[PDB]
């Protein structure tokens, strides 16, 4: 066992651009992916041709850089942006 969901959940610090996309600071893995799912649709970014893909608004680019992306790929895209937030207390390992 190395990675999973033991005890408290997992939160990742949003990027400057990613933060300007949704407007958060410390969220989870899904909350974000979803936050993008909603936002996208919210901004009528959703793509008709492909229900899996979605158009970019302008802030989604700086994040990915592609005109459009998949609703699932975001996971394997936002991750890179995802970072470890500031923990509370001493640490070693």
Indicate the burial class of 21 (C-beta count within 10 angstroms; 0-12, 13-18, 19 or more): buried
Contacts with 17 (C-beta within 8 Å, 6 or more apart), sequence order: 59, 62, 63, 81
Q: What is the CATH number of the domain that holds 14?
A: 1.10.245.10
Which helix H or strand E contains 55, and what residues bound it? Answer: strand 53-55
Beta bridge partners of 2: none
Give the number of domains in the chain.
1
Domain hosting 19: range is: 1-93
Query: Parallel, antiparallel, or unpaired for β 26-27 and 68-70?
Result: unpaired
Neighbours of 3 (CB within 10 A): 6
Question: b or e along 51-64 (b: 16 or more beta carbons within 10 Å of the residue's beta carbon)?
Answer: eebbbbeeebeebb
């Amino acid at each position: 066992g190395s990675s999973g969901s033991s005890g408290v959940p997992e939160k990742f610090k949003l990027s400057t651009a990613l933060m300007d996309v949704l407007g958060i600071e410390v969220e989870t893995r899904p909350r974000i992916i979803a936050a993008i799912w909603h936002y996208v649709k919210a901004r009528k970014l959703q793509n008709p041709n492909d229900p899996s893909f979605f158009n970019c608004d302008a802030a989604l680019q700086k994040v990915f850089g592609e005109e459009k992306l998949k609703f699932t790929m975001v996971s394997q895209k936002i991750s890179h942006h995802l970072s470890p937030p500031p923990p509370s207390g001493p640490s070693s390992g």
